[PDB]
Design a protein around this nucleic acid. Structure first.
Ligand SMILES: [Zn+2]
Lengths: 94, 97, 358, 109, 85, 98, 81, 109, 94
DNA sequence: TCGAGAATCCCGGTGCCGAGGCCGCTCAATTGGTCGTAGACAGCTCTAGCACCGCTTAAACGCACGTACGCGCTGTCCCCCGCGTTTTAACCGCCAAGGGGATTACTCCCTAGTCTCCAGGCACGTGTCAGATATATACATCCGA
DNA sequence: TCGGATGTATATATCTGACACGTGCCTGGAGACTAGGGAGTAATCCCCTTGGCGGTTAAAACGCGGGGGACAGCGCGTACGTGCGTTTAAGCGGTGCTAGAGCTGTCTACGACCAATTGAGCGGCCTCGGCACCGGGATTCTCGA
């Protein structure tokens, strides 16, 4: 019997930081899982097209940043972008 | 006799249904309708249960949206009832015809 | 005995304080009405009721009062400052509409100095408008965030007004193991308490120039009032169809002991009633039964309380009841020699029939 | 020897995995060759958005005295905002209901 | 017992349309709404089930699984969250 | 006595004429100035190719014509022949742009 | 720099657009609303086009950029590239 | 020896190229490996659709005595039909105008 | 100076069969070119996704046929499908 | 139901500039073999869909009354259309400068590909607490007098 | 304005099943290395954008008179809401069968990849006829009497 790959454990970890005593029912897990999959697909597809427009054949972080700047509406964009930058910086130093 | 004046039970029912979350169409009639419709495009089709449930949820959401926009049109013309001209106008504007 | 006479005198003091408390409430209510009428960023400020009886308030002169003015604030984020969770920094998450306090920011952090400065200015303007009773604002004391009103009708009353922010989010992670009344009052009451907002009060740390005026401490005055007034395992405890206990009487006696020693020996300046309340909270948790506080045994309960405090003195350790890693008796907060002094005084009083109560 | 392994999620201080995202990017056929900086950035963005939804829904749930989370709460949290509602302006959420809303003219005099 | 069916659209009763409308936020439904609503529902269901059946027939199966319906919906800009994907 | 068409007759002639040509209906230079002004806020010292300005103009004309079609339908729906701003607001609210 | 160019969209221009639309009696308050609608639409399209350009490290907003910005919002445009 | 070359468009009896479509399918990154039957089928479909549009537009052009074709004619041919209008229900055609259409109530008594 | 690749000549050939004496102006060539590109992109993308749904990793003619059956509305579908079949058959015999 | 007038359609002559065909040529498509894997196919296991039976009761069905709402008719008066005269700025044609787009050469560092190994994450099984439910209240709201 | 009726929110007690967590194990992610080509950068060419000047006439702006459509008001009658009593069938719990979904193990044909060869299609020309334009005349549709 094969096995499938989901995002249950990670969502549960993130929940245990911003509400340290409230659980989540399985239906909400299904919804959150599908939501994560959908957003990831949109961003990846947009970045892939955008890289293809300039004749490149790779996906640098810069393309992902531009895709995020294009999708998310308004203030979200700003905040989300900052997060990414910070993270990647802490990854490069190590 | 303790008759409520017209238009007062309606507001109570609105206040209630906009607050629950269960389904509003009975189940077995919907299942029968779905199978009847599917008979035309193929023969001897077997549906999983969750497929029927997904179809029902999508249809409920669509109809709710349609009535809400129809009500907006009906109010726009100095009225309170809704009649099929309103529905036809709403669907024509939204781009489905 | 001496204890019951002292209780009678403490109670009779309420008569001496009632009129001052009433003048204070009158002035405060006028100010609140004024603040709620004007259009400003402080329009939603309200008084937090924290109790006015001797048991609720800190040691104070009979004509000195304190009130907390709370304010609502949307979607704050708390960042730790120490290793013990003893101080916190405030930032703002995403706000769609537009941050109404945007212009009170200094970098990413809310400046308590600027907010208190505006608060003080507003208070000065409004206090100028109180025409029927002579109310002014005492000159700002550098190092104290309170705005102190002086009311003369015709005797002078001082009222320190402290601004407190009110937040509706989750209780901070540090408080995860605090308030351990699982067996005392059942977990349901604990949860219903933990489902309530919390407060932030400006307080500077003694740790160098950096971040002075930008630090805040937690306040749980509401939960403490609630627990104090609903303190029995039996629903009728201390109620009209229940039996009285000596819980508050013992608390009052120990607080008054500390008050009298602090009066006699200014060496004891760094101790306050919150240390006593934390210790006694621990004592009610270790020994939860009402039968351990029959009024007949009032004096015996007080003695068993004394021994606990001496042991707290001897190990130099007293965990905050809400913040378990926050040791109220750390070396850095209270010199060992002050505690040794207090130990000597407490032993003297306990062995000589509490002459300081005379 | 080989030093002790240290997963990339640790080296970036994130919570979502970064190996799995990289595998998906490589075998989804989005482009010929995926740079090595992309997965970190993308995992960070996903993690932020999920944190946002979960925080809002949790507040709305704890409002009316419930410990768990059910789709009604997700529907409330999503539809109430101003940005998150524009990003999900097409999506139906099963068992979500709607937002209490009665027009102004229908209400009695 | 492969019984062919006929006239099941009357299964969508009148109170069902009534309750859907009430959730929608209306106050006085007229008397000719019901036929038009039934027609609209029939059109929508046809347009979805055709694509669901095509997705199934491509994979050489006979069981119209939930994922098929989810994909048929998503193709028309009506993404559905909560049934797999 | 001067010869005067009664109200509502030149309008129909102009409708018949404009639904039959193709040339643009917004003068060029004011549109160019407006486009540059709007782009001023997102970057400094931009340079537009001509065909980009032309594309923007064609898209805008098409959008507005669609909007007026639908708002006219709404206006007739309520026993009138004159369009008013509430009609436009209703049409945009239904088409999902608000 | 420039200021107050939105008055460049004259009133007869809106009349002509409406007449092509199939309208008979324009009221007198239409103009102040059409101008706002047009401003919103251009703001959105031009912001997306400028992002597309700025990614490629240029300073010349070319026609293909605008075509892509339009196509993203489901308003495909045939006839420029 | 090598026999004389015979282009695939000849062997299929089509008009659109089949080499070029195959190259686009291979280097557009739509899937890992493109079968050898796809390009023929796809070129046939494209050719049919283009034949359809061109025939209709040409008839409409020759109607009003013109030899060439201009975008107005394409707009007419596309908008008049019933299927082709649904496939292009979003697309704007530059310099296309609209379809003559006046409502019934506006016209005089 | 590099060079670009278009569909002018092929469209012109197809025009010279169903209207053997009428020419085409350059603007119409631009429109027809863009139209061809757009339809080809839609069909290719749909087929690529559909092949990915069943875990395959190729593009058989069958997938292109199903994509056509999904996109084109109504009677077009039928007719278009037939054309494809006929063509591929004549390709296999040779 | 008629004249008079304004606007539109049709027709013949003139000039020009864009579509259409022709010529090199150069770079992509074709022919010809090779090989390593993805897809085809047979055979088996066992989950999930279909079919049915009896019953308990919640929802649908039908009917009667009547009252509020839709629809039609009139009037009135202010807003928008049609036309004329003056004034403003769009268009057209032509310079003239130079910033930046596009292309070419070359080199180096970042990513693919492999092998090995070892821990994170998935299937499964278990126990208890959060929620569903039933019942008795207290509190908020609507209608007629 | 009140009382009386109806409906709903709140507090308390009881069962039960799903979710939160250990436990075992396995396969895919990380470390360590090498090889090659994509893209980064500098240098140069030249075209397309900006900027300005001066004239010509088309359109915008403004003002006026006036016919007609929007809006408010009133009156009438039919049709949709509310409540009541009867009848239909949906849930529900439980069997029982078996078709087809899903997995595994082998083997064959077919698409990628490489190397050489050559002709289809692209850029750059020249040329003339299809259309834009102009002026006159015939057709027609609207308005007042
Ligand atoms: Zn007590």
């Amino acid at each position: 019997r094969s096995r499938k790959e989901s995002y249950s454990v990670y969502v549960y970890k993130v929940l245990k930081q911003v509400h340290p005593d409230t659980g989540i029912s399985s239906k909400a897990m299904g919804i959150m899982n599908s939501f994560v999959n959908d957003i990831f697909e949109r961003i990846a597809g947009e970045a892939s097209r955008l890289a293809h427009y300039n004749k490149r054949s790779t996906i640098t972080s810069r393309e992902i940043q531009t895709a995020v700047r294009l999708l998310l509406p308004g203030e979200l964009a700003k905040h989300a972008v900052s997060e990414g930058t910070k993270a990647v910086t802490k990854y490069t130093s190590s | 006799p303790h008759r409520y004046r017209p238009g007062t039970v309606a507001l109570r029912e609105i206040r209630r249904y906009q607050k629950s979350t269960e389904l509003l169409i009975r189940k077995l009639p919907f299942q029968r309708l779905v199978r009847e419709i599917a008979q035309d495009f193929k023969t001897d089709l077997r549906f999983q249960s969750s497929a029927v449930m997904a179809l029902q949820e999508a249809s409920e959401a669509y109809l709710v949206g349609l009535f809400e926009d129809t009500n907006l049109c009906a109010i726009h013309a100095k009225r309170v009832t809704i009649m099929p001209k309103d529905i036809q106008l709403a669907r024509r504007i939204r781009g489905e015809r | 005995d001496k204890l019951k006479k002292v209780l009678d005198k403490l109670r009779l003091k309420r008569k001496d304080i009632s009129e001052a408390a009433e003048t204070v409430n009158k002035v405060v209510e006028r100010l609140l009405r004024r603040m709620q009428k004007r259009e400003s960023e402080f329009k939603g400020v309200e008084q937090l009721n924290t109790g006015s009886y001797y048991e609720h308030v800190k040691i104070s002169a009979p004509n000195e009062f304190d009130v907390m003015f709370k304010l609502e604030v949307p979607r704050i984020e708390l960042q730790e400052y120490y290793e013990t969770g003893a101080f916190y920094l405030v930032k703002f998450k995403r706000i769609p509409r537009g941050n109404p306090l945007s212009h009170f920011l200094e970098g990413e952090v809310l400046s308590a100095t600027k907010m208190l400065s505006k608060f003080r200015k507003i208070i000065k303007e409004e206090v100028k408008e109180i025409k029927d009773i002579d109310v002014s604002v005492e000159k700002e004391k550098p190092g104290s965030p309170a705005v102190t009103l002086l009311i003369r009708n015709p005797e002078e009353i001082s009222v320190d007004i402290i601004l407190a922010l009110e937040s509706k989010g989750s209780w901070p992670i540090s408080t995860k193991e605090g308030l351990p009344i699982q067996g005392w009052l059942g977990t349901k009451v604990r949860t219903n308490l933990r489902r309530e907002p919390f407060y932030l009060v400006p307080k500077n740390a003694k740790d160098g120039n950096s971040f002075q005026g930008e630090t805040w401490r937690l306040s749980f005055s509401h939960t403490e009032k609630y627990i104090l007034n609903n303190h029995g395992i039996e629903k009728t405890c201390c109620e009209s169809s229940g039996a009285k206990c000596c819980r508050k009487e013992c608390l009052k006696l120990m607080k008054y002991l500390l008050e009298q020693l602090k009066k006699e020996f200014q060496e004891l300046d760094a101790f306050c009633s919150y240390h006593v309340k934390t210790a006694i909270f621990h004592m009610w948790t270790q020994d939860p039964q009402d039968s351990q506080w029959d009024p007949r045994n009032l004096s015996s309960c007080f003695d068993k309380l004394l021994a606990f405090f001496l042991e707290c003195l001897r190990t130099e350790k007293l965990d905050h009841y809400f913040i378990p890693k926050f040791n109220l008796f750390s070396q850095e907060l209270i010199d060992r020699k002050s505690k040794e002094f207090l130990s000597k005084k407490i032993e003297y009083e306990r062995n000589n029939g509490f002459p300081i109560f005379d | 020897a080989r030093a002790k392994a240290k997963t990339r999620s640790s080296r970036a201080g994130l919570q979502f995995p970064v190996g799995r995202v990289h595998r998906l990017l490589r075998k989804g056929n989005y482009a010929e060759r995926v740079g090595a900086g992309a997965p970190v950035y993308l995992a960070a963005v996903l993690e932020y958005l999920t944190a946002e939804i979960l925080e809002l829904a949790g507040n709305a749930a704890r409002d009316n005295k419930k410990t768990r989370i059910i789709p009604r709460h997700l529907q409330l949290a999503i539809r109430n905002d101003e940005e998150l509602n524009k990003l999900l302006g097409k999506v139906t959420i099963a068992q979500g209901g709607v937002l209490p809303n009665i027009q102004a003219v229908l209400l009695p005099k | 017992h492969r019984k062919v069916l006929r006239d099941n659209i009357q299964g969508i009763t009148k109170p069902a349309i009534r309750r859907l409308a009430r959730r929608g936020g209306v106050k006085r439904i007229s008397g000719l709404i019901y036929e038009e609503t039934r027609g609209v529902l029939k059109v929508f269901l046809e347009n979805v089930i055709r694509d669901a059946v095509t997705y199934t027939e491509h994979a050489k199966r006979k069981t119209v699984t939930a994922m098929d319906v989810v994909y048929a919906l998503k193709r028309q800009g009506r993404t559905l969250y909560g049934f797999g994907g």
